[PDB]
Amino acid sequence: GCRLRSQLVPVRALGLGHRSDELVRFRFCSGSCRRARSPHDLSLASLLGAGALRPPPGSRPVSQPCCRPTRYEAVSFMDVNSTWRTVDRLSATACGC
Amino acid sequence: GCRLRSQLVPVRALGLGHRSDELVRFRFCSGSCRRARSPHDLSLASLLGAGALRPPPGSRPVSQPCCRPTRYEAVSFMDVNSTWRTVDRLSATACGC
């Protein structure tokens, strides 16, 4: 089921040009929302399953909510110049379907 | 990009046990939200791309909003007994990232 996941990661791999010798906890949301389908979602999933819709241009429609963050906190670290840095709203602190 | 799509479908394939000789328009949302990534989404996509996260149990995290309906309308038809039927909130009428 959709829930908050928490791993350790290098700060360079965060994508903002920072560098640190400290790993940082990064939290994110993943898992199923299939128990949270709306009537529309059920009908869409039924139509797709029956092959009654032709695929649209680009990506397939999702037929259930996505597991997404609803709330965020900053990620902090000592950078290579041993200066404390904080980056707003980078890490999830709650998830929802 | 994420947008509303509109096709014709058999009402049986809607999944609620109805039957009709009339096709019905069913509308749904699909397409990319990659231009609507939050700072968290960008960092998550960067981490995944760098192979810095181990895959969680079940489905992969999404690193961008999902293209989802924000608004709904009923789907109507003459059933095989030529009785008018309406099913609430089945068809999308607006989409968002």
Side-chain angles (χ1 to χ4, degrees):
Chain A
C2 179
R3 48 161 95 59
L4 193 68
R5 317 292 183 174
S6 166
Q7 309 188 17
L8 295 163
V9 307
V11 331
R12 166 167 315 188
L14 290 171
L16 289 159
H18 308 96
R19 285 173 40 142
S20 171
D21 305 317
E22 307 190 332
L23 299 173
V24 303
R25 314 280 326 183
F26 185 83
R27 304 194 175 84
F28 63 92
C29 297
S30 78
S32 184
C33 290
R34 64 176 183 177
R35 302 195 78 189
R37 288 208 208 252
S38 68
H40 170 260
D41 293 347
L42 291 154
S43 289
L44 175 55
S46 176
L47 290 167
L48 295 170
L53 302 159
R54 266 333 232 261
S59 58
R60 200 142 172 80
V62 302
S63 58
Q64 63 175 274
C66 295
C67 178
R68 293 285 288 153
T70 53
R71 185 175 71 196
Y72 303 97
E73 77 177 321
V75 164
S76 297
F77 47 89
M78 303 299 45
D79 80 359
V80 290
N81 183 32
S82 30
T83 305
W84 179 85
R85 295 311 211 280
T86 194
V87 183
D88 297 354
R89 293 169 33 99
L90 282 196
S91 189
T93 67
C95 301
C97 288
Chain B
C2 179
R3 48 161 95 59
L4 193 68
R5 317 292 183 174
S6 166
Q7 309 188 17
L8 295 163
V9 307
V11 331
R12 166 167 315 188
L14 290 171
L16 289 159
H18 308 96
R19 285 173 40 142
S20 171
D21 305 317
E22 307 190 332
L23 299 173
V24 303
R25 314 280 326 183
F26 185 83
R27 304 194 175 84
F28 63 92
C29 297
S30 78
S32 184
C33 290
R34 64 176 183 177
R35 302 195 78 189
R37 288 208 208 252
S38 68
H40 170 260
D41 293 347
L42 291 154
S43 289
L44 175 55
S46 176
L47 290 167
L48 295 170
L53 302 159
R54 266 333 232 261
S59 58
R60 200 142 172 80
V62 302
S63 58
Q64 63 175 274
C66 295
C67 178
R68 293 285 288 153
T70 53
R71 185 175 71 196
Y72 303 97
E73 77 177 321
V75 164
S76 297
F77 47 89
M78 303 299 45
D79 80 359
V80 290
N81 183 32
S82 30
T83 305
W84 179 85
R85 295 311 211 280
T86 194
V87 183
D88 297 354
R89 293 169 33 99
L90 282 196
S91 189
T93 67
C95 301
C97 288

